[PDB]
Enzyme design. Sequence first.
Site, PDB file in Angstrom:
ATOM      1  N   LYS A 165       6.462   0.371  14.945  1.00 44.93           N
ATOM      2  CA  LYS A 165       5.185  -1.050  14.078  1.00 44.93           C
ATOM      3  C   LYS A 165       6.570  -1.597  12.836  1.00 44.93           C
ATOM      4  O   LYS A 165       7.156  -1.159  12.773  1.00 44.93           O
ATOM      5  CB  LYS A 165       4.035  -0.478  13.913  1.00 44.93           C
ATOM      6  CG  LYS A 165       4.159   0.319  12.692  1.00 44.93           C
ATOM      7  CD  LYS A 165       3.103   1.169  11.738  1.00 44.93           C
ATOM      8  CE  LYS A 165       3.046   0.750  10.415  1.00 44.93           C
ATOM      9  NZ  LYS A 165       1.164   1.016   9.926  1.00 44.93           N
ATOM     10  N   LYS A 195       9.548   6.163   7.589  1.00 44.56           N
ATOM     11  CA  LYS A 195       9.561   4.983   6.504  1.00 44.56           C
ATOM     12  C   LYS A 195      10.622   5.664   5.833  1.00 44.56           C
ATOM     13  O   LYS A 195      10.829   6.385   4.815  1.00 44.56           O
ATOM     14  CB  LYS A 195       8.668   4.918   6.077  1.00 44.56           C
ATOM     15  CG  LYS A 195       7.608   3.750   6.177  1.00 44.56           C
ATOM     16  CD  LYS A 195       5.897   3.684   5.257  1.00 44.56           C
ATOM     17  CE  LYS A 195       5.014   2.713   5.628  1.00 44.56           C
ATOM     18  NZ  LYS A 195       4.528   2.365   5.380  1.00 44.56           N
ATOM     19  N   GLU A 235      -5.002  -2.929   9.225  1.00 43.89           N
ATOM     20  CA  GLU A 235      -3.961  -3.365  10.416  1.00 43.89           C
ATOM     21  C   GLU A 235      -4.808  -3.394  11.805  1.00 43.89           C
ATOM     22  O   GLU A 235      -5.148  -1.772  11.588  1.00 43.89           O
ATOM     23  CB  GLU A 235      -2.728  -2.681  10.250  1.00 43.89           C
ATOM     24  CG  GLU A 235      -1.737  -2.220   8.981  1.00 43.89           C
ATOM     25  CD  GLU A 235      -0.362  -2.167   9.272  1.00 43.89           C
ATOM     26  OE1 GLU A 235      -0.203  -1.032  10.497  1.00 43.89           O
ATOM     27  OE2 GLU A 235       0.916  -1.687   8.386  1.00 43.89           O
ATOM     28  N   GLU A 270      -3.933   5.667  11.843  1.00 46.16           N
ATOM     29  CA  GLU A 270      -3.265   5.371  11.042  1.00 46.16           C
ATOM     30  C   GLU A 270      -3.827   5.959   9.877  1.00 46.16           C
ATOM     31  O   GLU A 270      -4.772   5.994   9.629  1.00 46.16           O
ATOM     32  CB  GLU A 270      -1.740   4.756  10.812  1.00 46.16           C
ATOM     33  CG  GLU A 270      -1.181   4.891   9.825  1.00 46.16           C
ATOM     34  CD  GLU A 270       0.154   4.037   9.890  1.00 46.16           C
ATOM     35  OE1 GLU A 270       0.931   3.753   9.017  1.00 46.16           O
ATOM     36  OE2 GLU A 270       0.448   3.380  10.830  1.00 46.16           O
ATOM     37  N   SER A 309       0.906  -1.287   0.254  1.00 46.62           N
ATOM     38  CA  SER A 309      -0.128  -0.228  -0.087  1.00 46.62           C
ATOM     39  C   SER A 309       1.275   1.609   0.217  1.00 46.62           C
ATOM     40  O   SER A 309       1.056   1.808   0.853  1.00 46.62           O
ATOM     41  CB  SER A 309      -0.578  -0.112   1.414  1.00 46.62           C
ATOM     42  OG  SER A 309       0.099  -0.257   2.443  1.00 46.62           O
ATOM     43  N   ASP A 351       1.055   8.941   7.089  1.00 45.16           N
ATOM     44  CA  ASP A 351       1.308   7.863   6.556  1.00 45.16           C
ATOM     45  C   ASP A 351       1.834   7.908   4.780  1.00 45.16           C
ATOM     46  O   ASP A 351       2.598   9.387   3.965  1.00 45.16           O
ATOM     47  CB  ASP A 351       1.410   6.051   6.521  1.00 45.16           C
ATOM     48  CG  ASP A 351       2.083   5.542   6.124  1.00 45.16           C
ATOM     49  OD1 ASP A 351       1.747   4.105   6.159  1.00 45.16           O
ATOM     50  OD2 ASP A 351       3.177   5.291   5.389  1.00 45.16           O
TER      51      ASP A 351
HETATM   52  O1  2PG Z   1       1.749   0.703   7.793  1.00 45.37           O
HETATM   53  C1  2PG Z   1       1.860   0.739   6.041  1.00 45.37           C
HETATM   54  O2  2PG Z   1       1.064   1.865   4.885  1.00 45.37           O
HETATM   55  C2  2PG Z   1       2.956  -0.925   5.390  1.00 45.37           C
HETATM   56  C3  2PG Z   1       3.433  -0.529   6.841  1.00 45.37           C
HETATM   57  O3  2PG Z   1       3.100  -1.306   7.660  1.00 45.37           O
HETATM   58  O4  2PG Z   1       1.839  -1.441   4.780  1.00 45.37           O
HETATM   59  P1  2PG Z   1       3.306  -1.371   3.217  1.00 45.37           P
HETATM   60  O5  2PG Z   1       4.457  -1.386   3.632  1.00 45.37           O
HETATM   61  O6  2PG Z   1       2.555  -1.918   2.207  1.00 45.37           O
HETATM   62  O7  2PG Z   1       2.502   0.553   3.002  1.00 45.37           O
HETATM   63 MG    MG Z   2       1.339   1.636   3.188  1.00 39.16          MG
HETATM   64 MG    MG Z   3       0.716   2.908   6.846  1.00 38.84          MG
END
Ligand code: 2PG
Ligand code: MG
Ligand code: MG
Lengths: 432, 433
Positions: B393, B342, B166, B292, B39, B317
Amino acid sequence: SIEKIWAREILDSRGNPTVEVDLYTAKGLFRAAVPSGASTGIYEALELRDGDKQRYLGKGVLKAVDHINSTIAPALISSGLSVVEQEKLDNLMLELDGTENKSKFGANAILGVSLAVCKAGAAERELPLYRHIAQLAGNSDLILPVPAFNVINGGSHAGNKLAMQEFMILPVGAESFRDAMRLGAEVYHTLKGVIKDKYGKDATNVGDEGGFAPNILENSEALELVKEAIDKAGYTEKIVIGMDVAASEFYRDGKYDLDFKSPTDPSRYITGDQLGALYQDFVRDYPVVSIEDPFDQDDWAAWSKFTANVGIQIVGDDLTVTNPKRIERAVEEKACNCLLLKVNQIGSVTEAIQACKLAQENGWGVMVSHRSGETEDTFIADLVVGLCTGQIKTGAPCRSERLAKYNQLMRIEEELGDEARFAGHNFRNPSV
Amino acid sequence: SIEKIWAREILDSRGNPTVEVDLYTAKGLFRAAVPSGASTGIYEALELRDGDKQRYLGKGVLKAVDHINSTIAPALISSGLSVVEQEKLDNLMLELDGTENKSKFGANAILGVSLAVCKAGAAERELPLYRHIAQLAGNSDLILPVPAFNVINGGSHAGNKLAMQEFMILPVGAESFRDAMRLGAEVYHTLKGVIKDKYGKDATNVGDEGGFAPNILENSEALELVKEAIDKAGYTEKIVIGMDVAASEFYRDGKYDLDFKSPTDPSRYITGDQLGALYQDFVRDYPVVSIEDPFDQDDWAAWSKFTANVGIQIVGDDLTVTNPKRIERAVEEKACNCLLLKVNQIGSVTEAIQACKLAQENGWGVMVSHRSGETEDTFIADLVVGLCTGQIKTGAPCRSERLAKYNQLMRIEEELGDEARFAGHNFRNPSVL
Ligand SMILES: O=C(O)[C@@H](CO)OP(=O)(O)O
Ligand SMILES: [Mg+2]
Ligand SMILES: [Mg+2]
Ligand SMILES: [Mg+2]
Ligand SMILES: [Mg+2]
């Protein structure tokens, strides 16, 4: 000598405690961790758990850790033995525990030290791990093995009715190890879609080893899905199938239960002769070239009779539990023609190497194996190369406790450079 | 100075290719690898992929790997800079790429070198990784974070109808990080039993991040399942709930589709208001202390209004993508009060430490995060300690690409000895400890 050992509890890939060990020399720090099975044969060396039901549900490994920190460590240190002496250090640990099944310290205690000593040993020799192991084993041609990927899961612990534990793909026709990984991954991702198309997205989540667990019963249907994914990927000519039936898990009063995850009912139960005939149809109808634990770990007659009636590889796991004494008996009785090699079934590196050499000495194949509860540790990737066995099963190409090993095989292949060889179609006997 | 840099393709935890990098200095080999999102935010730095359909469905990273081996590696060797100079080495790479979103080499190429340089620098300084990070960051409190464990997976991480990505448990009551590990695992295993007894064993397989993928649609029902397991494990006081909705994955023509993995039918779609109201129920019925991406990455009005209307943590995010520009805009519009950190959304260590300091100076929380596609790399573990963020996380306590980070945090706590402190109820704001 050894300067310090420090053992601790970590979490394995299912979220249960296991033993990890730090061992320090003048060369630095060396760390290893111990894996854990779910379909554990009754003859495996003891996995010591704490059994405090109020703590990790009885699954902690504080007792094993303490045996390391309190008893094994002081002893090995004061011995002053060099970490190159794998055998003497392992025998010392074996005499100290003083039991046959390592029930005093736990085999998880002894092995965590034994692996970390081996890593220390490599560096004392200034060799990478896979070459040290090969020296401990008297080997030279450090062949890369064909990986066997567990892609569809059933058995004792699986959310579905499928009795047989593992259906694997082996890229016997890939060009190199790196190539095998690529074939395994493409088939895996193709399979996912074949499952989603046939069963629904719900059916595409993963089990313990990274494989899929569709809601199916017929073992013929799993094999069918696997062969479809191999065609649709376009590798029919390059990829074969191996099975781990893990038949001890459905052995019932001297017959066999192919529905057993259902609540009980003895009317279905079939005999070993009937189960043998199913495998013969599987071997005729699908490209199955290997079958592991086709019968119960005690049903010796069915093993010998089967082995003498087939041309495929027949693998002892729960039958042999990487145990020299059990392997000699399988040798005498011609029970099987391949050892599944699990360091934690016997509980030291030295005894695993010996189990290996005995199988190979008597013309057996040898397949190195993960447990279904693995850690980020990658020792076994070095082990299979060092032991020249030419075959390894260490999971689907999914979940990094499985890929940690795959990725490290790629690193080894790359480390060997121009001199690297892949077992390909000689996986059963790469000594050619 | 750097002696050599060798990059290769390895496989991530979903069995797709990703970059790993071997960096050699006088001290030896330093290795790191690059995680990969499913995602992924539209504003994320470019993850460079090969696009060769005859190879891993076009998902190869041969191009990014060759950028490192043939162009970035001699660039950094020629500079003669010590590995300790994270910032200079990162700028070097950012200038050589010379694009905003790192589309010449890929964020994946730049980051893997950035991470490796980072571990090499810690060895040069004779420091463990988390202390070196703390020194790049100008911290000296090395507090241990509350782990947030993604114990039910939905959205783009699981084969089920469940739309929100999540459902997380946070052992805020734990005594220590190591004790937070025990609470997390016991609830997880308890929940396997709850889900098994209610939905069948087929409902106990797992999605990408290690959480159970039960065959459900209602997000309330996931929350319900988690509450039940907290309670049955005996931890109602000590453990609270977090969510990653990731509403961007199910934003459909100005609306939200909580059944996006089913055959399309636009009548089922709801507005952001309906979605918000839904969040207000969850917050009153359940010990949800954090949510989130509750709205789409471009849906700023819904974000600011929901945030002004709650006292819980609200996490950016895909809204912020670990990017200082987007963060400034979020601070100004008061979109959210927490940054999801990230490294690979932005593409370098130096940038990510900068995005962190930015959030913390504007009074925000910072939650460090794995990606859905991870590796055996334990970098972010040292990163969260070094950055003193107080929350990480990095998966369910299941699948070793998760547990390699949690096990590492336990090792770091044990290494800090009596200096070890646990973020606890202060996970939003650990500086006061
Ligand atoms: O929180 C998110 O969005 C992430 C990590 O948990 O998923 P992805 O790495 O698929 O973006
Ligand atoms: Mg994601
Ligand atoms: Mg996220
Ligand atoms: Mg077994
Ligand atoms: Mg087996």
